[PDB]
Copies of this chain bind each other. A is one copy, B any other.
Amino acid sequence: PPGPPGQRGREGPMGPRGPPGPPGPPG
| Per-position 1/0 for A1-18, Cβ under 8 A of B | 111111111111111111
Q: Which residues of B contact A10 (CB under 8 A)?
A: 5, 8-9, 11-12
Total identical chains: 3
Tell me which of B3, B19, B27 contacts A21 (CB under 8 A).
B19
Pairs A–B under 8 Å by Cβ, sample size 22: A2-B7, A3-B3, A5-B5, A5-B8, A5-B10, A7-B9, A8-B9, A8-B10, A9-B12, A11-B14, A12-B13, A13-B15, A14-B14, A14-B19, A15-B15, A17-B20, A17-B22, A20-B23, A22-B24, A23-B24, A24-B24, A25-B27
Chain A residues within CB distance 8 Å of chain B: 1-27
